[PDB]
Amino acid sequence: LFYRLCSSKQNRNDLMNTFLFILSEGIIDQHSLEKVYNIISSRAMGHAKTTTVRQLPSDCTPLTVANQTIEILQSLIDADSRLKYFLIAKKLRWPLWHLFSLLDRKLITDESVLMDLLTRIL
């Protein structure tokens, strides 16, 4: 579904931006994960922040969210051909550097699967 949506320029840009935002300020800690989840839920509802009361699922942890996000992003990069160009195109302005930040987080560096997928993307 995400690959199909990528055929649209606006949808592709928005989806990539949301992916990078999640991976940047989402996979830090449980509280940060909850904050980003509330932000995303409010965005889906129609506004930016609004109410900030949304309990996270019990089984949802930064590990699983990071795994799913990185898996989807790697699949998109492998399938689509114009996404890597978007990634390539203060250093946080360049989208690619966001992925670089992940190398400084214990949650990511401690997982073989996450490391493999991130290394494939890079």
PDB file of N, CA and C in Angstrom, residues 14-82:
ATOM      1  N   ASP A  14       4.847  13.430   1.959  1.00  0.00           N
ATOM      2  CA  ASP A  14       4.295  13.436   3.309  1.00  0.00           C
ATOM      3  C   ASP A  14       4.646  12.153   4.053  1.00  0.00           C
ATOM      4  N   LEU A  15       4.549  11.009   3.374  1.00  0.00           N
ATOM      5  CA  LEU A  15       4.847   9.734   4.012  1.00  0.00           C
ATOM      6  C   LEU A  15       6.311   9.654   4.423  1.00  0.00           C
ATOM      7  N   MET A  16       7.220  10.078   3.541  1.00  0.00           N
ATOM      8  CA  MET A  16       8.636  10.065   3.892  1.00  0.00           C
ATOM      9  C   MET A  16       8.918  11.005   5.056  1.00  0.00           C
ATOM     10  N   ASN A  17       8.295  12.187   5.052  1.00  0.00           N
ATOM     11  CA  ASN A  17       8.495  13.124   6.150  1.00  0.00           C
ATOM     12  C   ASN A  17       8.024  12.526   7.469  1.00  0.00           C
ATOM     13  N   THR A  18       6.859  11.873   7.463  1.00  0.00           N
ATOM     14  CA  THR A  18       6.355  11.259   8.687  1.00  0.00           C
ATOM     15  C   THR A  18       7.267  10.129   9.153  1.00  0.00           C
ATOM     16  N   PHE A  19       7.752   9.310   8.218  1.00  0.00           N
ATOM     17  CA  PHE A  19       8.688   8.248   8.576  1.00  0.00           C
ATOM     18  C   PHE A  19       9.921   8.817   9.263  1.00  0.00           C
ATOM     19  N   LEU A  20      10.532   9.834   8.653  1.00  0.00           N
ATOM     20  CA  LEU A  20      11.741  10.415   9.222  1.00  0.00           C
ATOM     21  C   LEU A  20      11.462  11.048  10.578  1.00  0.00           C
ATOM     22  N   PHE A  21      10.325  11.732  10.715  1.00  0.00           N
ATOM     23  CA  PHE A  21       9.981  12.343  11.995  1.00  0.00           C
ATOM     24  C   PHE A  21       9.829  11.287  13.083  1.00  0.00           C
ATOM     25  N   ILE A  22       9.139  10.185  12.771  1.00  0.00           N
ATOM     26  CA  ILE A  22       8.980   9.107  13.744  1.00  0.00           C
ATOM     27  C   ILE A  22      10.341   8.562  14.149  1.00  0.00           C
ATOM     28  N   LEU A  23      11.181   8.238  13.163  1.00  0.00           N
ATOM     29  CA  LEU A  23      12.476   7.645  13.486  1.00  0.00           C
ATOM     30  C   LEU A  23      13.379   8.627  14.221  1.00  0.00           C
ATOM     31  N   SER A  24      13.165   9.929  14.038  1.00  0.00           N
ATOM     32  CA  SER A  24      14.036  10.921  14.655  1.00  0.00           C
ATOM     33  C   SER A  24      13.640  11.185  16.103  1.00  0.00           C
ATOM     34  N   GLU A  25      12.408  11.648  16.330  1.00  0.00           N
ATOM     35  CA  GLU A  25      11.969  11.997  17.677  1.00  0.00           C
ATOM     36  C   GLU A  25      10.998  10.980  18.265  1.00  0.00           C
ATOM     37  N   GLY A  26      10.822   9.830  17.622  1.00  0.00           N
ATOM     38  CA  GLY A  26       9.940   8.808  18.149  1.00  0.00           C
ATOM     39  C   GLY A  26      10.668   7.702  18.884  1.00  0.00           C
ATOM     40  N   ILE A  27      11.730   7.178  18.282  1.00  0.00           N
ATOM     41  CA  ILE A  27      12.470   6.048  18.872  1.00  0.00           C
ATOM     42  C   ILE A  27      13.589   6.662  19.704  1.00  0.00           C
ATOM     43  N   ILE A  28      13.219   7.150  20.887  1.00  0.00           N
ATOM     44  CA  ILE A  28      14.191   7.622  21.868  1.00  0.00           C
ATOM     45  C   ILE A  28      13.923   6.926  23.195  1.00  0.00           C
ATOM     46  N   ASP A  29      12.690   7.039  23.681  1.00  0.00           N
ATOM     47  CA  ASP A  29      12.304   6.460  24.959  1.00  0.00           C
ATOM     48  C   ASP A  29      10.789   6.307  24.967  1.00  0.00           C
ATOM     49  N   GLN A  30      10.289   5.568  25.961  1.00  0.00           N
ATOM     50  CA  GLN A  30       8.856   5.297  26.028  1.00  0.00           C
ATOM     51  C   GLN A  30       8.048   6.589  26.053  1.00  0.00           C
ATOM     52  N   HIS A  31       8.480   7.571  26.847  1.00  0.00           N
ATOM     53  CA  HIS A  31       7.760   8.838  26.905  1.00  0.00           C
ATOM     54  C   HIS A  31       7.788   9.550  25.557  1.00  0.00           C
ATOM     55  N   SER A  32       8.945   9.556  24.891  1.00  0.00           N
ATOM     56  CA  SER A  32       9.026  10.158  23.566  1.00  0.00           C
ATOM     57  C   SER A  32       8.139   9.416  22.576  1.00  0.00           C
ATOM     58  N   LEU A  33       8.096   8.084  22.677  1.00  0.00           N
ATOM     59  CA  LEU A  33       7.221   7.305  21.809  1.00  0.00           C
ATOM     60  C   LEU A  33       5.762   7.686  22.026  1.00  0.00           C
ATOM     61  N   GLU A  34       5.355   7.842  23.288  1.00  0.00           N
ATOM     62  CA  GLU A  34       3.987   8.255  23.579  1.00  0.00           C
ATOM     63  C   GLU A  34       3.701   9.644  23.021  1.00  0.00           C
ATOM     64  N   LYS A  35       4.653  10.568  23.168  1.00  0.00           N
ATOM     65  CA  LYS A  35       4.453  11.920  22.654  1.00  0.00           C
ATOM     66  C   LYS A  35       4.269  11.906  21.141  1.00  0.00           C
ATOM     67  N   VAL A  36       5.128  11.170  20.432  1.00  0.00           N
ATOM     68  CA  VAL A  36       5.024  11.128  18.976  1.00  0.00           C
ATOM     69  C   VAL A  36       3.737  10.431  18.555  1.00  0.00           C
ATOM     70  N   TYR A  37       3.319   9.407  19.304  1.00  0.00           N
ATOM     71  CA  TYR A  37       2.059   8.739  18.992  1.00  0.00           C
ATOM     72  C   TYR A  37       0.884   9.694  19.137  1.00  0.00           C
ATOM     73  N   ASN A  38       0.876  10.496  20.203  1.00  0.00           N
ATOM     74  CA  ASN A  38      -0.192  11.475  20.379  1.00  0.00           C
ATOM     75  C   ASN A  38      -0.168  12.516  19.268  1.00  0.00           C
ATOM     76  N   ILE A  39       1.026  12.972  18.885  1.00  0.00           N
ATOM     77  CA  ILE A  39       1.130  13.944  17.800  1.00  0.00           C
ATOM     78  C   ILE A  39       0.563  13.361  16.512  1.00  0.00           C
ATOM     79  N   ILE A  40       0.917  12.112  16.204  1.00  0.00           N
ATOM     80  CA  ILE A  40       0.443  11.483  14.976  1.00  0.00           C
ATOM     81  C   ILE A  40      -1.068  11.290  15.018  1.00  0.00           C
ATOM     82  N   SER A  41      -1.603  10.869  16.167  1.00  0.00           N
ATOM     83  CA  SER A  41      -3.046  10.694  16.280  1.00  0.00           C
ATOM     84  C   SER A  41      -3.775  12.015  16.071  1.00  0.00           C
ATOM     85  N   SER A  42      -3.279  13.092  16.684  1.00  0.00           N
ATOM     86  CA  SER A  42      -3.896  14.397  16.482  1.00  0.00           C
ATOM     87  C   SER A  42      -3.814  14.820  15.022  1.00  0.00           C
ATOM     88  N   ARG A  43      -2.663  14.596  14.383  1.00  0.00           N
ATOM     89  CA  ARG A  43      -2.530  14.919  12.967  1.00  0.00           C
ATOM     90  C   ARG A  43      -3.553  14.157  12.138  1.00  0.00           C
ATOM     91  N   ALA A  44      -3.753  12.877  12.449  1.00  0.00           N
ATOM     92  CA  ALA A  44      -4.754  12.090  11.740  1.00  0.00           C
ATOM     93  C   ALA A  44      -6.150  12.656  11.960  1.00  0.00           C
ATOM     94  N   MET A  45      -6.442  13.114  13.180  1.00  0.00           N
ATOM     95  CA  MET A  45      -7.770  13.655  13.455  1.00  0.00           C
ATOM     96  C   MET A  45      -8.020  14.941  12.675  1.00  0.00           C
ATOM     97  N   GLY A  46      -6.978  15.736  12.429  1.00  0.00           N
ATOM     98  CA  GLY A  46      -7.126  16.935  11.627  1.00  0.00           C
ATOM     99  C   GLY A  46      -6.309  18.121  12.098  1.00  0.00           C
ATOM    100  N   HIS A  47      -5.968  18.164  13.381  1.00  0.00           N
ATOM    101  CA  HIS A  47      -5.188  19.258  13.940  1.00  0.00           C
ATOM    102  C   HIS A  47      -3.794  18.775  14.323  1.00  0.00           C
ATOM    103  N   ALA A  48      -2.962  19.726  14.750  1.00  0.00           N
ATOM    104  CA  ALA A  48      -1.565  19.422  15.042  1.00  0.00           C
ATOM    105  C   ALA A  48      -1.410  18.715  16.384  1.00  0.00           C
ATOM    106  N   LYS A  49      -1.764  19.393  17.475  1.00  0.00           N
ATOM    107  CA  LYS A  49      -1.566  18.853  18.816  1.00  0.00           C
ATOM    108  C   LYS A  49      -2.874  18.568  19.536  1.00  0.00           C
ATOM    109  N   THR A  50      -3.753  19.562  19.659  1.00  0.00           N
ATOM    110  CA  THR A  50      -5.029  19.399  20.349  1.00  0.00           C
ATOM    111  C   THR A  50      -4.864  18.620  21.649  1.00  0.00           C
ATOM    112  N   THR A  51      -5.815  17.738  21.946  1.00  0.00           N
ATOM    113  CA  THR A  51      -5.741  16.939  23.162  1.00  0.00           C
ATOM    114  C   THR A  51      -4.536  16.006  23.119  1.00  0.00           C
ATOM    115  N   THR A  52      -3.894  15.832  24.271  1.00  0.00           N
ATOM    116  CA  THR A  52      -2.717  14.980  24.414  1.00  0.00           C
ATOM    117  C   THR A  52      -2.981  13.824  25.375  1.00  0.00           C
ATOM    118  N   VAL A  53      -4.155  13.207  25.267  1.00  0.00           N
ATOM    119  CA  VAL A  53      -4.556  12.098  26.128  1.00  0.00           C
ATOM    120  C   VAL A  53      -4.841  10.909  25.220  1.00  0.00           C
ATOM    121  N   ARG A  54      -3.851  10.028  25.060  1.00  0.00           N
ATOM    122  CA  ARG A  54      -4.019   8.815  24.261  1.00  0.00           C
ATOM    123  C   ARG A  54      -3.026   7.783  24.787  1.00  0.00           C
ATOM    124  N   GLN A  55      -3.520   6.845  25.591  1.00  0.00           N
ATOM    125  CA  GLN A  55      -2.657   5.819  26.158  1.00  0.00           C
ATOM    126  C   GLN A  55      -2.128   4.901  25.063  1.00  0.00           C
ATOM    127  N   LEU A  56      -0.832   4.609  25.127  1.00  0.00           N
ATOM    128  CA  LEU A  56      -0.216   3.739  24.141  1.00  0.00           C
ATOM    129  C   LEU A  56      -0.629   2.286  24.385  1.00  0.00           C
ATOM    130  N   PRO A  57      -0.691   1.468  23.333  1.00  0.00           N
ATOM    131  CA  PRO A  57      -0.977   0.043  23.537  1.00  0.00           C
ATOM    132  C   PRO A  57       0.059  -0.604  24.443  1.00  0.00           C
ATOM    133  N   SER A  58      -0.402  -1.574  25.237  1.00  0.00           N
ATOM    134  CA  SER A  58       0.474  -2.205  26.220  1.00  0.00           C
ATOM    135  C   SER A  58       1.660  -2.888  25.550  1.00  0.00           C
ATOM    136  N   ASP A  59       1.417  -3.593  24.444  1.00  0.00           N
ATOM    137  CA  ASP A  59       2.479  -4.319  23.761  1.00  0.00           C
ATOM    138  C   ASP A  59       3.331  -3.428  22.868  1.00  0.00           C
ATOM    139  N   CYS A  60       2.968  -2.157  22.705  1.00  0.00           N
ATOM    140  CA  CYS A  60       3.736  -1.250  21.863  1.00  0.00           C
ATOM    141  C   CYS A  60       4.913  -0.693  22.654  1.00  0.00           C
ATOM    142  N   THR A  61       6.114  -0.873  22.125  1.00  0.00           N
ATOM    143  CA  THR A  61       7.343  -0.381  22.725  1.00  0.00           C
ATOM    144  C   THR A  61       8.191   0.240  21.629  1.00  0.00           C
ATOM    145  N   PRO A  62       9.178   1.061  21.994  1.00  0.00           N
ATOM    146  CA  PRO A  62      10.036   1.659  20.958  1.00  0.00           C
ATOM    147  C   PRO A  62      10.682   0.624  20.058  1.00  0.00           C
ATOM    148  N   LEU A  63      11.003  -0.556  20.592  1.00  0.00           N
ATOM    149  CA  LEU A  63      11.627  -1.596  19.779  1.00  0.00           C
ATOM    150  C   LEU A  63      10.736  -1.983  18.604  1.00  0.00           C
ATOM    151  N   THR A  64       9.472  -2.314  18.882  1.00  0.00           N
ATOM    152  CA  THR A  64       8.580  -2.790  17.828  1.00  0.00           C
ATOM    153  C   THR A  64       8.259  -1.684  16.829  1.00  0.00           C
ATOM    154  N   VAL A  65       8.006  -0.470  17.320  1.00  0.00           N
ATOM    155  CA  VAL A  65       7.712   0.642  16.424  1.00  0.00           C
ATOM    156  C   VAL A  65       8.902   0.910  15.513  1.00  0.00           C
ATOM    157  N   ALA A  66      10.109   0.925  16.082  1.00  0.00           N
ATOM    158  CA  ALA A  66      11.304   1.132  15.274  1.00  0.00           C
ATOM    159  C   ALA A  66      11.462   0.027  14.242  1.00  0.00           C
ATOM    160  N   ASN A  67      11.238  -1.224  14.648  1.00  0.00           N
ATOM    161  CA  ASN A  67      11.381  -2.339  13.719  1.00  0.00           C
ATOM    162  C   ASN A  67      10.420  -2.196  12.548  1.00  0.00           C
ATOM    163  N   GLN A  68       9.143  -1.940  12.837  1.00  0.00           N
ATOM    164  CA  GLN A  68       8.158  -1.820  11.766  1.00  0.00           C
ATOM    165  C   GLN A  68       8.474  -0.639  10.856  1.00  0.00           C
ATOM    166  N   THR A  69       8.817   0.510  11.444  1.00  0.00           N
ATOM    167  CA  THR A  69       9.113   1.690  10.641  1.00  0.00           C
ATOM    168  C   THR A  69      10.305   1.447   9.727  1.00  0.00           C
ATOM    169  N   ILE A  70      11.381   0.878  10.274  1.00  0.00           N
ATOM    170  CA  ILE A  70      12.581   0.651   9.478  1.00  0.00           C
ATOM    171  C   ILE A  70      12.314  -0.392   8.402  1.00  0.00           C
ATOM    172  N   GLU A  71      11.527  -1.422   8.721  1.00  0.00           N
ATOM    173  CA  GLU A  71      11.187  -2.425   7.719  1.00  0.00           C
ATOM    174  C   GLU A  71      10.434  -1.796   6.555  1.00  0.00           C
ATOM    175  N   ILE A  72       9.423  -0.978   6.860  1.00  0.00           N
ATOM    176  CA  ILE A  72       8.646  -0.347   5.798  1.00  0.00           C
ATOM    177  C   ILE A  72       9.533   0.578   4.975  1.00  0.00           C
ATOM    178  N   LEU A  73      10.377   1.368   5.643  1.00  0.00           N
ATOM    179  CA  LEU A  73      11.237   2.302   4.923  1.00  0.00           C
ATOM    180  C   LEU A  73      12.215   1.567   4.015  1.00  0.00           C
ATOM    181  N   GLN A  74      12.817   0.483   4.510  1.00  0.00           N
ATOM    182  CA  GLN A  74      13.749  -0.285   3.692  1.00  0.00           C
ATOM    183  C   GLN A  74      13.043  -0.909   2.497  1.00  0.00           C
ATOM    184  N   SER A  75      11.841  -1.451   2.708  1.00  0.00           N
ATOM    185  CA  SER A  75      11.093  -2.015   1.591  1.00  0.00           C
ATOM    186  C   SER A  75      10.781  -0.948   0.550  1.00  0.00           C
ATOM    187  N   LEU A  76      10.367   0.240   0.999  1.00  0.00           N
ATOM    188  CA  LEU A  76      10.085   1.326   0.066  1.00  0.00           C
ATOM    189  C   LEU A  76      11.332   1.719  -0.715  1.00  0.00           C
ATOM    190  N   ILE A  77      12.470   1.841  -0.027  1.00  0.00           N
ATOM    191  CA  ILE A  77      13.702   2.239  -0.702  1.00  0.00           C
ATOM    192  C   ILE A  77      14.102   1.196  -1.736  1.00  0.00           C
ATOM    193  N   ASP A  78      14.028  -0.086  -1.371  1.00  0.00           N
ATOM    194  CA  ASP A  78      14.393  -1.140  -2.312  1.00  0.00           C
ATOM    195  C   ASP A  78      13.458  -1.157  -3.514  1.00  0.00           C
ATOM    196  N   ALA A  79      12.155  -0.995  -3.282  1.00  0.00           N
ATOM    197  CA  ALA A  79      11.192  -1.058  -4.376  1.00  0.00           C
ATOM    198  C   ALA A  79      11.234   0.207  -5.224  1.00  0.00           C
ATOM    199  N   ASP A  80      10.947   1.354  -4.617  1.00  0.00           N
ATOM    200  CA  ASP A  80      10.952   2.610  -5.349  1.00  0.00           C
ATOM    201  C   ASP A  80      12.384   3.031  -5.671  1.00  0.00           C
ATOM    202  N   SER A  81      12.519   3.839  -6.726  1.00  0.00           N
ATOM    203  CA  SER A  81      13.818   4.315  -7.179  1.00  0.00           C
ATOM    204  C   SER A  81      14.049   5.797  -6.928  1.00  0.00           C
ATOM    205  N   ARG A  82      12.991   6.594  -6.791  1.00  0.00           N
ATOM    206  CA  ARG A  82      13.128   8.030  -6.588  1.00  0.00           C
ATOM    207  C   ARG A  82      13.189   8.428  -5.119  1.00  0.00           C
TER     208      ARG A  82
END
